[PDB]
Design a protein around this ligand. Structure first.
Ligand SMILES: NC(=O)c1ccc[n+]([C@@H]2O[C@H](COP(=O)([O-])OP(=O)(O)OC[C@H]3O[C@@H](n4cnc5c(N)ncnc54)[C@H](O)[C@@H]3O)[C@@H](O)[C@H]2O)c1
Ligand SMILES: NC(=O)c1ccc[n+]([C@@H]2O[C@H](COP(=O)([O-])OP(=O)(O)OC[C@H]3O[C@@H](n4cnc5c(N)ncnc54)[C@H](O)[C@@H]3O)[C@@H](O)[C@H]2O)c1
Ligand SMILES: Nc1nc2c(ncn2[C@@H]2O[C@H](COP(=O)(O)OP(=O)(O)OP(=O)(O)O)[C@@H](O)[C@H]2O)c(=O)[nH]1
Ligand SMILES: Nc1nc2c(ncn2[C@@H]2O[C@H](COP(=O)(O)OP(=O)(O)OP(=O)(O)O)[C@@H](O)[C@H]2O)c(=O)[nH]1
Ligand SMILES: Nc1nc2c(ncn2[C@@H]2O[C@H](COP(=O)(O)OP(=O)(O)OP(=O)(O)O)[C@@H](O)[C@H]2O)c(=O)[nH]1
Ligand SMILES: Nc1nc2c(ncn2[C@@H]2O[C@H](COP(=O)(O)OP(=O)(O)OP(=O)(O)O)[C@@H](O)[C@H]2O)c(=O)[nH]1
Ligand SMILES: Nc1ncnc2c1ncn2[C@@H]1O[C@H](COP(=O)(O)OP(=O)(O)OP(=O)(O)O)[C@@H](O)[C@H]1O
Ligand SMILES: Nc1ncnc2c1ncn2[C@@H]1O[C@H](COP(=O)(O)OP(=O)(O)OP(=O)(O)O)[C@@H](O)[C@H]1O
Ligand SMILES: O=c1[nH]cnc2c1ncn2[C@@H]1O[C@H](COP(=O)(O)O)[C@@H](O)[C@H]1O
Ligand SMILES: O=c1[nH]cnc2c1ncn2[C@@H]1O[C@H](COP(=O)(O)O)[C@@H](O)[C@H]1O
Ligand SMILES: O=c1[nH]cnc2c1ncn2[C@@H]1O[C@H](COP(=O)(O)O)[C@@H](O)[C@H]1O
Lengths: 484, 484, 131, 79
């Protein structure tokens, strides 16, 4: 027999003293496994599951098309901000969705009568090189040939008037697959064909769809990417709660959004509940994420309205000044614990929103019940963030401002310190998270939360001196160098 | 008639007051042309000419294979440092040379009896994907087939034992060109072939050489690259003046160095002159660059020894502490002017070495007679610089230390502030240089120096208050944001 | 007085001074009188002028520790002889002969070259003389 | 023939502008020898000669018996 040490989560938060991420620790356990065995699959909404617990917040300083793509390629997800025109946001969503497609049912096509100028224009506009050619120049017509970049490289920049009929590979020479073939078999006939495209045709011999080799190359290159049933990246977008956001929502849903995150400082309001009802009534197949909530009472009515996933955290963001504009707020540790313990019964996952500044906080938030963790400032200065770097005091920086920072300024605008590529940063966050889980002794995140709720995971309250002692405190100067 | 204003160069430097880059200006002239018309072709040695005036200094914190490639791809050149093993430096030189080749006379080949594991190993080791296959597995044998990446992608990671005979395209199907064909015609048969390779063969039907499409793609992508007669990048390397550097020089010359830069703090010495003579005696086809010199007398004996190009500047580097270890030195403006005016008669170009910190200094050094300008600190923290970034005080930095900074420390070690890609930084330097030349009114750099020597380009001496006034002085805080 | 670097040690020997007297460089070496004391996370030895105190003609300060004299002086000698070598002088007598005969030629250094003559482009740095 | 560069000492100090150690340099020359061949014997007085040019100043914060010994052991002297 060995004495019990530490306080269970319910015992630590029973005092109602207002703890946060920096005021407690997790006592370590046992290791019977290697860190890489840790499984990080985390639920985002009741019908969406991610292969990593990391999300990017919807703001005008993060989550462009580039950041959304770079996040979706590592299992996470990206929420495009709504501080922009409805058609601009829909364009960004379409751009994120059209990255890898499989069956491309709406490609770019042309006709023999077109000219090399047309293929060059299509290239310069979209980036798609391959262009199937059809009699009429649309899908509902017989296939004639395909023109790609390798057919345009050797031109002399003065024969652009040449008709595409003189550069396409004729239909008789193409390799195609009959319509109705499953993707697996289509990928097989593409690979054994050892070529770059397969324009699918039917018994009538007219183009129906097309497949590309670089798509399966990307699949082989990024095993952890997040995709829907059509083998294309998942994308999210934020929306307000005005009567004029219905048009924006319609535009987004036509663009192909998968999950919508209602965006407000406080979720508890008739205005938000009405839009949740509207979304569930007009788009029954769309996943909606509730607004900011910090309380069980603040959640109950949103869950009743029909939110598929909640977003917990208010007044806590590294840019948020709600706690000073108004007196309202709640420390993030208490908020996460006391909205997750209530939400677990109805099966609605939670998103620990704001306040994350280190892998320690990323693992703490995942320990307290948050299925996934949303993160705005850490990803603020990565290469994928929108904007262009600028040199402030002998250092290149990217601006970082809250989306409501400006009648009243609820936020602040600042600068962050450059971090390199998201595709090279996220793996380090994943490695740190799984190392922390290993040290705790958790086979996975679901087990990590099971240990907490059953009482097996025991915390200890950290005083101020231990908070200072918990960092680096005895050095004259130093450097960090995370591997990233 | 309008009065003459300003001091010619000879009038400005006649006072022997020890001016530098910050103590004078160039009065502006007339504009009858657009900036982009400025031609920046600059001589490096008596038999090497560059399409840009920028060089990277040989140091252990710059000019790796990556930086040398990134510089050679923009017209400049890169000098690989000699603070490394002879075989390591030779490997770096060979790596820089084997970037784009045209006729690849020593490719990687294999034989039917090999296995897919062999092609995968060659890929993982070198990076070359295409591998012509021959009966014996060497050049002196009949060609049988070629295996590339598109023939290996669809394998299942468990049939690696498969013989390459089951994946190569057989000789009967290949497209080849007869031996003795000129490169232009070979490139033509490659482009009209609309295919990725041409393994050259002779009347005996055995492999002699091979060409690649990505090489001419790079040629089309980088019009300003610097290459020798064999269509591969120029590379330079530094060497010491000991009796044991002969082996290093032999290894480098076998690796294919084009220009050698004798590396010493002071060039005037029997030890340096003896190695200049040795190089000219054993490698008559090699361009050698003299050591650091600051005086006409200091140059005369090196020119007599046979230096093909001089390197002017001593005690001036942003990291150099020679002026404090010893009393010797000379301000860079006076040194450049008074070693270029002497060197012009013998036709030996000059390299303004050290002290450059801005495009203003880059254009000042080119105005005073320096055919090309060598630059170590500006390129110090770019992505291509050797080493990995590290976070010091909320900012990621790359170390920058002088190659002699450590019996006695003649240098210092510090940090620099990250600058992004060389391929994205050098174009901004070129644009700034040509804008300055345009403002002066010079059609090109040769005209810019002609105006100075003839007296048409007139400077003015800048006092301390104008030095402060010449910058930014009235702002509380600010940002720069160069386009780069 | 006024010597602060091997550069000044060689400059003073170039201008005619047969030998050079030096007070501050040797101030904090282990052999200096007194005991080290920690001021701001650093152990230092006091350094004050002998007339620093009716009237104070001097000042009292602190210096930064330098290790043994027997391990410091050889580095000064090595630096001096390296500077003489770079000048091209077989010895100090020859170094002064060249100056008086006119063979040793100086150049006047302006303020910008004084800044340029040091370390000026680094964010932070370290020196580490071998000593 | 190679032009003369720089100012002799008498030419540099003729201006009576008040130069110091930080306001001038020595232009470099030629090397036909190794550094260790440099001989540093320096005269201290008319009847005393030292093997190094370094002296320690007489002050209450330097030149005790220990510093005088440590200096005399390297050719110099201690006051
Ligand atoms: N998560 C955080 O910590 C946090 C906090 C504050 C702000 N923010 C960010 O700033 C943005 C702005 O926040 P906000 O709360 O000021 O904006 P908001 O639109 O969510 O709320 C501001 C006001 O809008 C009103 N409103 C909403 N719908 C309405 C309707 N249909 N009719 C009439 N009035 C209506 C509300 O009553 C409220 O007074 C958020 O969308 C979010 O991106 C985040
Ligand atoms: N350009 C600058 O401002 C500058 C200044 C100082 C140092 N540096 C860098 O630091 C490096 C080191 O400079 P350094 O002058 O100390 O090194 P170096 O080898 O060039 O000279 C140092 C010593 O080597 C001796 N030496 C050279 N060849 C010899 C031989 N064959 N036999 C005997 N002795 C020989 C010289 O006599 C001299 O005393 C340089 O190569 C350069 O990269 C640059
Ligand atoms: N054309 C095409 N095929 C794809 C794409 N992504 C996956 N596939 C194919 O669809 C199947 C997906 O199974 P896996 O290869 O295991 O892919 P994965 O890494 O599990 O990725 P997911 O299946 O999305 O979880 C295989 O036949 C893939 O080759 C894509 O973007 N385009
Ligand atoms: N830009 C663009 N990409 C599309 C479009 N539709 C599908 N894609 C996908 O984007 C990629 C476009 O591939 P291509 O531009 O043909 O690529 P490529 O010419 O083979 O060149 P690389 O793949 O880059 O070597 C594929 O992954 C397509 O599935 C479209 O309309 N525009
Ligand atoms: N195979 C091959 N051919 C090349 C390469 N570089 C240039 N060429 C060809 O050689 C000739 C070079 O002439 P240009 O096309 O004008 O090239 P450039 O931009 O002037 O480059 P340089 O000729 O090196 O100055 C053309 O036939 C090119 O296609 C290369 O790396 N590989
Ligand atoms: N790594 C490597 N490159 C070589 C070698 N010899 C020549 N090269 C050049 O390096 C490039 C190698 O091209 P590959 O690796 O075949 O390129 P690829 O498979 O066509 O793929 P991408 O060109 O990157 O789309 C060409 O520019 C060659 O000319 C070698 O031995 N190793
Ligand atoms: N399905 C197909 N059947 C027959 N020929 C095809 C097919 N797809 C492409 N081609 C032809 O093959 C050649 C190049 O095909 P590929 O797909 O490699 O082009 P690409 O991918 O744009 O080349 P690159 O690697 O330069 O981007 C062209 O002649 C093109 O018309
Ligand atoms: N000269 C040639 N003649 C005939 N077939 C060739 C020739 N060169 C390559 N191939 C074949 O063409 C196919 C792919 O050629 P390609 O040069 O596009 O490969 P790759 O450049 O490695 O492709 P990727 O774009 O994926 O890198 C393979 O079947 C290869 O064996
Ligand atoms: O202007 C703003 N005011 C207040 N909160 C904001 C503002 N913009 C974004 N936020 C939120 O602040 C959090 C930012 O996460 P962080 O990385 O902890 O700063 C997220 O919840 C954002 O949605
Ligand atoms: O350790 C060193 N001491 C002195 N000079 C150095 C050292 N390393 C490099 N240098 C030179 O200092 C110059 C650096 O250029 P910068 O960019 O002006 O610093 C070049 O001449 C380098 O060759
Ligand atoms: O109290 C003082 N006032 C003024 N000069 C002093 C005093 N003490 C020492 N000195 C002199 O100042 C010089 C010190 O050399 P330093 O190393 O250049 O400071 C020597 O000439 C000392 O003799």
């Amino acid at each position: 027999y060995v004495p019990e040490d530490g306080l269970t989560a319910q015992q630590l938060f029973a005092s109602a003293d207002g703890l946060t991420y920096n005021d407690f620790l997790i006592l370590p356990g046992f290791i019977d496994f290697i860190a890489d065995e840790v499984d990080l699959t985390s639920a985002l909404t009741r019908k969406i599951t991610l292969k990593t617990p990391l999300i990017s917040s919807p703001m005008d300083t993060v989550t462009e098309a580039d950041m959304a793509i770079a996040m979706a390629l590592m299992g996470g997800i990206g929420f495009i901000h709504h501080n922009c025109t409805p058609e601009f946001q829909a364009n960004e969503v379409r751009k994120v969705k059209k990255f890898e497609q499989g069956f491309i049912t709406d490609p770019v096509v042309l006709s023999p009568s077109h000219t090399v100028g047309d293929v060059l224009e299509a290239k310069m506009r979209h980036g798609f090189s391959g262009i199937p050619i059809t009699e009429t120049g649309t899908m509902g017509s017989k296939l004639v040939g395909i023109v790609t970049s390798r057919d345009i490289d050797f031109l002399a920049e003065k024969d652009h008037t040449t008709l595409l009929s003189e550069v396409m590979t004729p239909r008789i020479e193409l390799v195609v697959a009959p319509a109705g073939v499953t993707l697996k078999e289509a990928n097989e006939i593409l690979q054994r064909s050892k070529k770059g495209k397969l324009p699918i045709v039917n018994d009538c011999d007219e183009l129906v769809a097309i497949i590309a080799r670089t798509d399966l190359k990307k699949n082989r290159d990024y095993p952890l990417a997040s995709k829907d049933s059509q083998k294309q990246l998942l994308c999210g977008a934020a929306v307000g709660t005005r009567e004029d956001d219905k048009y924006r929502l319609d535009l987004l849903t036509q663009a192909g959004v998968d999950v919508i995150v209602l965006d407000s400082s406080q979720g508890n309001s008739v205005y938000q509940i009405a839009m949740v009802h509207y979304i569930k009534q007009k788009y029954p197949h769309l996943q909606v994420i509730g607004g900011n909530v910090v309380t069980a009472a603040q959640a109950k009515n949103l869950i009743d309205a029909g939110v598929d996933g909640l977003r917990v955290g208010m007044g806590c963001g590294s840019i948020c000044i709600t706690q000073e504009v108004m007196a309202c707020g709640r420390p993030q540790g208490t908020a996460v614990y006391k909205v997750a313990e209530y939400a677990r019964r109805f099966g609605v996952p939670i998103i620990a929103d704001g306040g994350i500044q280190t892998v320690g906080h990323v693992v703490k938030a995942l320990a307290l019940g948050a299925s996934t963790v949303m993160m705005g400032s850490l990803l603020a200065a990565t290469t994928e963030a929108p904007g262009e770097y600028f040199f402030s005091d002998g250092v290149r920086l990217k601006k970082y401002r809250g989306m409501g920072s400006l009648k009243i300024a609820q936020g602040v605008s600042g600068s962050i310190q450059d971090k390199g590529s998201i595709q090279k940063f996220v793996p380090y966050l994943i490695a740190g998270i799984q190392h922390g889980c290993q040290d705790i002794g958790a086979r996975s995140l679901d087990v990590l939360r099971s240990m907490m709720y059953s009482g097996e995971l025991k915390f200890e309250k950290r005083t101020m001196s231990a908070q200072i002692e918990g960092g680096v405190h005895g050095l004259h100067s130093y450097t960090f160098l995370p591997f990233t």
